[PDB]
Structure 1
Amino acid sequence: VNFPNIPAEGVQFRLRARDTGYVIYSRTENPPLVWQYNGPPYDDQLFTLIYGTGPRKNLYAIKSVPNGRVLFSRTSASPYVGNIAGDGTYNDNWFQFIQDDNDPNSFRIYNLASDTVLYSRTTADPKFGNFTGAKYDDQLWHFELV
């Protein structure tokens, strides 16, 4: 089931993991360019959504406010999670927000092209990344409105 409370197109938000409380950031310089962060609000944590239409209905591109790059999540090459210029040129730029089976207020950030979800953990490296497989709580996210 698609998450019922997806931010309106163009509305700004942070993506915060339910369990770690870490936020995603997306920047242009200094690897890792997309990663997680525990600390104060910065502009590279701000995103908006481009709403997919036609064949991309129910999918969304996640665009970074300061730099305008969209997120990707792939299994084909490293880095697996990153950003790229444009408004969603590549199929791996398109995400579905899938409501959790148990928790109605959180969702998985799912990539149809790569069959992956994003995760945030405090355990082992890599502490942020993507994953194809079973459902774990560390894959659960909130939209944090600003």
Structure 2
Amino acid sequence: DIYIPPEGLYFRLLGFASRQVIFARNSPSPDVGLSPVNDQATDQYFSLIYGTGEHAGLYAIKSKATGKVLFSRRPAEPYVGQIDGDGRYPDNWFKIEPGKTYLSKYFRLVQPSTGTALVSRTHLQPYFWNHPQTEVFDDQYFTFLFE
């Protein structure tokens, strides 16, 4: 019962471990990362693109500020970022994987073909990153924050 929004409805992605939201911006560098929940800046907002055909069941994550979609990959560095193209690459496509107990209202964002999960944390850099999906930590959990 994690609500997943339709296309066109905007949200921010809050991390359980970091209490911050993902940003995707034009400038300054870096162009992706984490920023303060309280700011509610446009570059914290995203909407989903629903995958079809080979990406049926997966979602791309499109920035309101830049129009680009998030990627999560290995082994090419850097491991996370944004790019043009509305999900033209396999690493733009995420599975939403709900947690349990205290994470029942959160989920991982797993990019299945590279086998990575997004990370949002405060204890180690990079603060916004990814991790092999097979090894689970609390800081891979996110929740949609809507207006």
TM-score, with length taken from structure 2? 0.91
Question: Alpha-carbon deviations, 1:98-130, whole Å to 9, x = none?
Answer: 011333210001101211111111112222200
Show the counterpart of 1:70: 69
Show the counterpart of 1:97: 96
Show the counterpart of 1:52: 51
Distance between the aligned counterparts of 1:48 and 1:40, measured in 2? Answer: 18
Show the counterpart of 2:145: 144
**Paired residues, number:** 144
Distance between the aligned counterparts of 1:32 and 1:115, measured in 2? Answer: 24
Distance between the aligned counterparts of 1:98 and 1:56, measured in 2? Answer: 15
Query: Deviation of residue 71 (structure 1)?
Result: 0.5
Show the counterpart of 1:13: 11
Kindly provide the amino acid, as one letter, of the partner of residue 6 in structure 1.
Answer: I
Distance between the aligned counterparts of 1:128 and 1:138, measured in 2? Answer: 10
Question: Alpha-carbon deviations, 1:69-90, whole Å to 9, x = none?
Answer: 0000111322210000111000
Cα distance 1:4–1:41, how it changes in 2: closer, same or farther (>3 A)?
A: closer
Q: Pick from 13, 24, 36 the counterpart of residue 22 of structure 2.
A: 24
CA contact (8 A) 2:68 2:83 kept: yes
Distance between the aligned counterparts of 2:78 and 2:105, measured in 1? Answer: 29
CA contact (8 A) 2:26 2:65 kept: no
Show the counterpart of 2:42: 43
Show the counterpart of 2:86: 87
Question: Alpha-carbon deviations, 1:6-32, whole Å to 9, x = none?
Answer: 111111000000232110000123321
In structure 2, the gaps of 5 or more residues are none
CA contact (8 A) 2:72 2:91 kept: yes
Distance between the aligned counterparts of 1:99 and 1:57, measured in 2? Answer: 18
Kindly provide the amino acid, as one letter, of the partner of residue 78 in structure 2.
Answer: P
Identity of aligned residues (%): 42
Name whichever structure is richer in helix by fraction.
Answer: 2
Query: Structure 1 stretch 89-98 or stretch 3-12: which is displaced more?
Result: 3-12
Question: Alpha-carbon deviations, 1:22-78, whole Å to 9, x = none?
Answer: 100001233211101124110000000000112211100100012100000111322
> SS where residue 44 of structure 1 aligns?
helix
Moved over 4 A (4+): none
Kindly provide the amino acid, as one letter, of the partner of residue 32 in structure 2.
Answer: V
TM-score, with length taken from structure 1? 0.92
